[PDB]
């Protein structure tokens, strides 16, 4: 089947109405009831929340990623979603993981790291997708014999949404991505 | 300076009730505001959240741990674990992650599960209560500045146990392990 | 901007005919003169000379790749490529290389061989096509400083072609993945 | 069961002392006949050697630690201490190896030596305990196959120690400790 | 079977006439016909086809090696040695590959890279003279099944030459170094 | 220079004698007075300590290596040497290590492990040459800024002798090979 992709000329927020956009569309074209969102701060699962229903499910930055300690997620943001029926999860990205620790000590790479630097070859979003796919089945948030649409960007909003088949941690590459909805073309 | 301590003859089960309680009365007497420990099924959690005060949580199995998106953590235990008024965590376990992914896959190990391995040669219970010990503070939970006291168990139990400033994963070798309170002799 | 995009319900040399009429007209659409393809017989890259102008490369397998000391590559199927202008190349596998010797004398994997597990989550195509890319880069076959249309399939034939930049093995993180002409969505 | 440890407020030199007389009491009431220790210069094992009874061993800092073909246990000294009537090595410390000479070389780190910093967590001198602990076992000097008692430090001193059953490098992970004595808080 | 060996005193440029003079002798002694040598610029390509006969494959440095989407190769020197009869050929080099690009980007090593690291505690040709003979292998270039006479030198000209049987990327580990015709000592 | 070089035919014990002969005549062509041997039985360094004179270090397998526990080599002869002024040592090969019990629990390649392997494309003997001339490095027995004859070969006996540079542990990179004295050509 040919569908319609839509390729932004430049990656970043200037894209995420698009994409969440295309989001609704493709995820009624298909049946898709399953959604997991990068959203750091909250703006992102807020304005798909309101657009679609089903299992929205928002993934934040690890505990202390731009200072240690405290999470850039407030409560505050963690309840106007607990409200509209969103799941909220903060955990350990998995496609860095304590590997990532590592490499910050001595300055190499581990195997997870590489993952994720070859999945940023068509752009960074489409990596997140991947990563928050992971961290959700894993987190049991989500399925991982249903199709889902796993949305991030690059650093804030979003760029990327993809329709993929979520695997657990365990079972890594037997995730498979079945369709890219939109994606930054750089 | 100095404190007290404790061996177990042979490993698992037979041991969370005199390591609880001596985990308890230790955890008690060492006085803190925050803890953290690994049941599978919730039990061992159960017998713990009566005898805190402060932050309990605990954290399982990630789902698909035995079969594709199955978490164990009943929600009939969820719900009693969330209700009994202290936290409830299911993420990828911080020493193995994907890592233990791509070994399923190809057959060898990765940095992260090299530790787990390491830990592991005192006992078994000994890695999880880091494991779990990191999971838990990058889920924007439990401190990584100030003291923290780690529970954990070997097979179905809670046999080992101990008190550490865990770390997140960036900067996870940062982790200072502080005492042992008990842990099987092999 | 918004495109077109073919999703193969299955792998298979079957999709062959529709991805190089696609690229076809995507070519035409952007102006793109530069195709690397994965033929280890030459068939496919056969067929496609016959519908694009330009510079086409067909790779094939190394020597080696199922007998010792043996190409797949016929000598007059080469023949019959060379003899229609289209740059024939057979060298060690980008994605793999010696590292797969090293894996099939000692089991686990090496960095190099996970960025090819990692590009498989998409399809096997997808895997070759920036494989080829790289490998035909180091050649000196095409350039890191355009865009090309890279083709790959399953085993057979091809069902996934990609618009890229490529990019040379000591600067392989700077391949860029731009569009997705068409892919198998299992 | 049940015993008993100690913890040091800041870490070092000023420890030993009291390192050492605890490490022996309970090296002595734990009753055990092979043991092995880690002296730079060979004080620190100096103070140790009239406190027990049996195997003591000192293993120190491999030649070129500090500058090419330079150990440093003082010939003065190595007879001392072959003198006072108990083993003396010298090797390739078992937890860094040629390791250590690929990440000088390159920039990283390897597993083994992920291991000495998994270990350090805890205490420097907690993992020089595990180190040297193997050293020994491989140079065909302490048993693999019964308790010895392990003694390390940080710096310049002998803060920590422990108890197990060391193991050799083709069967490492068979190592089982079993007992902490004493240790940096930190 | 004892037989000469040079060792040049130092490295370099210099040492190419005796070393190209040397290979002709013990080719002859053996009745060895396949040569594969480093040339980048084909300077010493061309002196060495003008003293041995048979298949001699020449293979410079992969494009890219020095700048972005560049062939050191000159087009004219390509076309005096295909005028000649070599076979000249250009491709990722086989002991560092995509490796190297990860490096470049992350720091440490990848397994392959070490394996030329060690190759180099002999000379910096002992190590291009194995690196050829799979490159040339896994081109069809040249057999894994007889033995074969590999050049190479210290950046410019030659300096090693061995007698080996090449081995694919896939059965690295199953090259054969037979002799040294010369060495740098160093 | 031009030097004679002996390929053994076929690798093994056979050979023995010759690699000893030739050891004589070089280290007297060259004055090198420092001798590293491989020998597990100790019949090797012994056969050697009776036709020179000077500084022999005879290294044996590891502690229980056939039979964990115990070391293949008695005091006994432990003291046949000790008495012709031989230094004895036992320690952890340098080019396996720990790495080697990881790979022999998860079933990898450590990447020393990878250097023993890529040493062996020439002989075995060559590989243990530059490992046991590492062990005794750092074990303080012999220079690292003098020349050496290192002795090793195939399972038992001698086939490989090579005048080399060691170098520690931790410089391990800079050991150079200057001679191939003698070595199996297979
Ligand atoms: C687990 C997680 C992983 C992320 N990693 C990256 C990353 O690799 N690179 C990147 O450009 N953005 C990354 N992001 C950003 C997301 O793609 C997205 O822009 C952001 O979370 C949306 O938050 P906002 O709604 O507050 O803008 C990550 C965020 C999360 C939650
Ligand atoms: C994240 C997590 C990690 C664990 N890893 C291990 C492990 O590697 N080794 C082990 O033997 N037990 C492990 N356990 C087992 C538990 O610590 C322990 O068996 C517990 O008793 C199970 O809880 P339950 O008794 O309440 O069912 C792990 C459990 C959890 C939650
Ligand atoms: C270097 C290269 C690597 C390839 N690796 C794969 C692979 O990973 N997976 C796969 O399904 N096919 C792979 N192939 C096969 C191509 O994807 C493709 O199926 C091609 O059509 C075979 O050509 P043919 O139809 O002329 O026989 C690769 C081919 C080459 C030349
Ligand atoms: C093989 C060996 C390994 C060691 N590794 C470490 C290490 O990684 N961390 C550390 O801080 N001290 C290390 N030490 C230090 C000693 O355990 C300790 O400082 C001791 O006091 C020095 O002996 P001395 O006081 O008799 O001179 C090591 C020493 C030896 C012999
Ligand atoms: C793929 C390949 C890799 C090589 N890598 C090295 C290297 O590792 N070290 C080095 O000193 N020279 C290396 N070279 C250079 C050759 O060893 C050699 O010096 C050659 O003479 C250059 O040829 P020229 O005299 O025609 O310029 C390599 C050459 C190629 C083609
Ligand atoms: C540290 C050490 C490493 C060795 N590793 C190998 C090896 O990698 N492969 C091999 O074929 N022989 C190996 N050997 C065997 C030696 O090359 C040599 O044959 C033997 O030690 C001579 O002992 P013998 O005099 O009792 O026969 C090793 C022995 C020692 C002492
Ligand atoms: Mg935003
Ligand atoms: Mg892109
Ligand atoms: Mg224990
Ligand atoms: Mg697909
Ligand atoms: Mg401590
Ligand atoms: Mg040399
Ligand atoms: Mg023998
Ligand atoms: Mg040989």
């Given at each position: 089947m040919e569908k319609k992709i839509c390729y932004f000329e430049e990656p970043g927020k200037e894209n995420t109405e698009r994409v969440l956009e295309l989001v609704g569309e493709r995820a009624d074209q298909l049946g898709i009831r399953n959604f997991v969102v990068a959203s750091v701060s909250g703006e992102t699962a807020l304005r798909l929340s309101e657009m679609v229903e089903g299992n929205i499910v928002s993934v934040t930055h690890h505990?202390?990623?731009?200072?240690?300690?405290?999470?850039?997620?407030?409560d505050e943001a963690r309840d106007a979603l607990l409200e509209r029926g969103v799941n909220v999860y903060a955990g350990s990205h998995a496609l860095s993981g304590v590997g990532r620790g590592i490499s910050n000590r001595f300055g190499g790479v581990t195997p997870v790291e590489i993952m994720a630097e070859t999945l940023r070859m068509v752009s960074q979003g489409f990596k997140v997708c991947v990563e928050i796919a992971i961290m959700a089945a894993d987190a049991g948030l989500i399925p991982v014999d249903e199709e889902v649409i796993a949305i991030g960007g690059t650093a804030?909003?979003?760029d990327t949404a993809l329709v993929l088949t979520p695997a657990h941690?365990?079972?890594?590459?037997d995730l498979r991505i079945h369709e890219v909805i939109a994606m930054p073309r750089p």
């Open positions: 505990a202390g990623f731009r200072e240690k300690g405290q999470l850039e997620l407030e804030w909003g979003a941690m365990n079972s890594v590459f």
